Design an enzyme around this catalytic site. Structure first.
Site, PDB file in Angstrom:
ATOM      1  N   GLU A  36       0.915  -1.294   0.086  1.00  0.00           N
ATOM      2  CA  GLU A  36       0.139  -0.101   0.034  1.00  0.00           C
ATOM      3  C   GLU A  36       0.821   1.152   0.118  1.00  0.00           C
ATOM      4  O   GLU A  36       0.773   2.167  -0.950  1.00  0.00           O
ATOM      5  CB  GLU A  36      -0.912  -0.053   1.116  1.00  0.00           C
ATOM      6  CG  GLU A  36      -1.651   1.281   1.270  1.00  0.00           C
ATOM      7  CD  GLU A  36      -2.621   1.778   0.029  1.00  0.00           C
ATOM      8  OE1 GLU A  36      -2.845   2.835  -0.110  1.00  0.00           O
ATOM      9  OE2 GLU A  36      -2.948   0.495  -0.592  1.00  0.00           O
ATOM     10  N   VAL A  97      -2.772   5.490   2.378  1.00  0.00           N
ATOM     11  CA  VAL A  97      -1.726   5.198   3.618  1.00  0.00           C
ATOM     12  C   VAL A  97      -2.204   5.208   5.055  1.00  0.00           C
ATOM     13  O   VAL A  97      -2.159   4.659   5.905  1.00  0.00           O
ATOM     14  CB  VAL A  97      -0.705   6.100   3.702  1.00  0.00           C
ATOM     15  CG1 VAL A  97       0.595   5.368   3.021  1.00  0.00           C
ATOM     16  CG2 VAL A  97      -0.787   7.873   2.890  1.00  0.00           C
ATOM     17  N   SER A  98      -3.573   6.113   5.316  1.00  0.00           N
ATOM     18  CA  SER A  98      -4.060   6.094   6.259  1.00  0.00           C
ATOM     19  C   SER A  98      -4.605   4.766   6.949  1.00  0.00           C
ATOM     20  O   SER A  98      -4.529   4.663   8.379  1.00  0.00           O
ATOM     21  CB  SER A  98      -5.330   6.848   6.285  1.00  0.00           C
ATOM     22  OG  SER A  98      -6.518   6.447   5.766  1.00  0.00           O
TER      23      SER A  98
HETATM   24  C1  LIG Z   1       7.259   6.505   0.108  1.00  0.00           C
HETATM   25  N1  LIG Z   1       6.361   7.470  -0.488  1.00  0.00           N
HETATM   26  C2  LIG Z   1       5.219   7.783  -0.281  1.00  0.00           C
HETATM   27  C3  LIG Z   1       4.447   7.111   0.923  1.00  0.00           C
HETATM   28  C4  LIG Z   1       3.211   7.170   1.136  1.00  0.00           C
HETATM   29  C5  LIG Z   1       2.548   8.416   0.532  1.00  0.00           C
HETATM   30  C6  LIG Z   1       3.148   9.134  -0.422  1.00  0.00           C
HETATM   31  C7  LIG Z   1       2.294  10.173  -0.846  1.00  0.00           C
HETATM   32  C8  LIG Z   1       2.922  11.021  -1.841  1.00  0.00           C
HETATM   33  C9  LIG Z   1       2.331  12.195  -2.469  1.00  0.00           C
HETATM   34  O1  LIG Z   1       1.182  12.376  -2.315  1.00  0.00           O
HETATM   35  N2  LIG Z   1       3.037  13.077  -3.362  1.00  0.00           N
HETATM   36  C10 LIG Z   1       2.435  14.173  -3.870  1.00  0.00           C
HETATM   37  C11 LIG Z   1       3.688  14.960  -4.217  1.00  0.00           C
HETATM   38  C12 LIG Z   1       3.236  16.249  -4.992  1.00  0.00           C
HETATM   39  C13 LIG Z   1       2.127  16.729  -4.989  1.00  0.00           C
HETATM   40  C14 LIG Z   1       0.985  15.938  -4.652  1.00  0.00           C
HETATM   41  C15 LIG Z   1      -0.344  16.393  -4.644  1.00  0.00           C
HETATM   42  C16 LIG Z   1      -0.705  16.029  -6.194  1.00  0.00           C
HETATM   43  O2  LIG Z   1      -0.549  16.809  -7.167  1.00  0.00           O
HETATM   44  O3  LIG Z   1      -1.104  14.774  -6.345  1.00  0.00           O
HETATM   45  C17 LIG Z   1       1.292  14.581  -4.052  1.00  0.00           C
HETATM   46  C18 LIG Z   1       4.239  10.554  -2.153  1.00  0.00           C
HETATM   47  O4  LIG Z   1       5.039  11.473  -3.187  1.00  0.00           O
HETATM   48  N3  LIG Z   1       5.067   9.742  -1.526  1.00  0.00           N
HETATM   49  C19 LIG Z   1       4.491   8.914  -0.704  1.00  0.00           C
END
Ligand SMILES: CNc1cccc2cc(C(=O)Nc3cccc(CC(=O)O)c3)c(=O)[nH]c12
EC number: 5.6.2.2
Length: 196
Positions: A36, A97-98
């Site tokens: 996940e 992730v939640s």
């Molecule tokens: C291990 N890595 C890892 C684990 C768990 C959760 C995440 C979530 C993100 C993430 O939501 N990134 C992200 C970056 C920039 C802009 C946005 C908003 C959008 O434009 O969609 C989201 C990630 O990058 N890595 C993650």
């Protein structure tokens, strides 16, 4: 107010984990917790910002997933009173992730973004403090390390390298171009997945 719904969602998940993560005695749900989180890093790679992903099995029986993407946005998302990152880690909705955060006894988030390193710690999905800046950095990415709650998982409580290795190989085949590293801190074995 919104914290209210979040804690409602967290209840929901810790109360019926099989509904969100899978079986809690099999190994199946425990390992799904990793995929996940890796799933989330793959989205950031499908967006064209992440080149390498690093899944590490640590010696204390926790797992981390590191990417070199943009880093989760840190700006306080000023409808709710907290960093966008905290909303991502704590709100329900591939389950998000939640679910993993809710069934983790402990979870560490480290984001490197706009020249800063931010860290937040959670317990059973609940933040110890708001996302805080811990120093400067010139690189970007997100790292999530979690320790599975032993109140939720029984019987098969230890990660198996070959179960991750297999799924990560598969995910590298399905997402041409991403590079994934698996390292087992327990005995030093490594592997590298990349299907041109
Ligand atoms: C291990 N890595 C890892 C684990 C768990 C959760 C995440 C979530 C993100 C993430 O939501 N990134 C992200 C970056 C920039 C802009 C946005 C908003 C959008 O434009 O969609 C989201 C990630 O990058 N890595 C993650």
């Amino acid at each position: 107010s919104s914290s209210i719904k979040v804690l409602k969602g967290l209840d929901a998940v810790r109360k019926r984990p099989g509904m969100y993560i899978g079986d809690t005695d099999d190994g199946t749900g425990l390992h799904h917790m990793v995929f996940e989180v890796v799933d989330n890093a793959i989205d950031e790679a499908l967006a064209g910002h992440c080149k390498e992903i690093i899944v590490t099995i640590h010696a204390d029986n926790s797992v981390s997933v590191q990417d070199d993407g943009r880093g989760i946005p840190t700006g306080i998302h000023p409808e709710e009173g907290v960093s966008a990152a905290e909303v991502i880690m704590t709100v329900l909705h591939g389950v998000g992730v939640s679910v993993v955060n809710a069934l983790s006894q402990k979870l560490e988030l480290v984001i490197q973004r706009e020249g800063k390193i931010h860290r937040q710690i959670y317990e059973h999905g609940v933040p110890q403090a708001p996302l805080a800046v811990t120093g400067e950095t010139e690189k970007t990415g997100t790292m999530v390390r979690f320790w599975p709650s032993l109140e939720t998982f029984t019987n098969v409580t230890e990660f198996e390298y070959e179960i991750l290795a297999k799924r990560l190989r598969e995910l590298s085949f399905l997402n041409s171009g991403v590079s994934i590293r698996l390292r087992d801190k327990r005995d030093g074995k490594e592997d590298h997945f990349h299907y041109e």
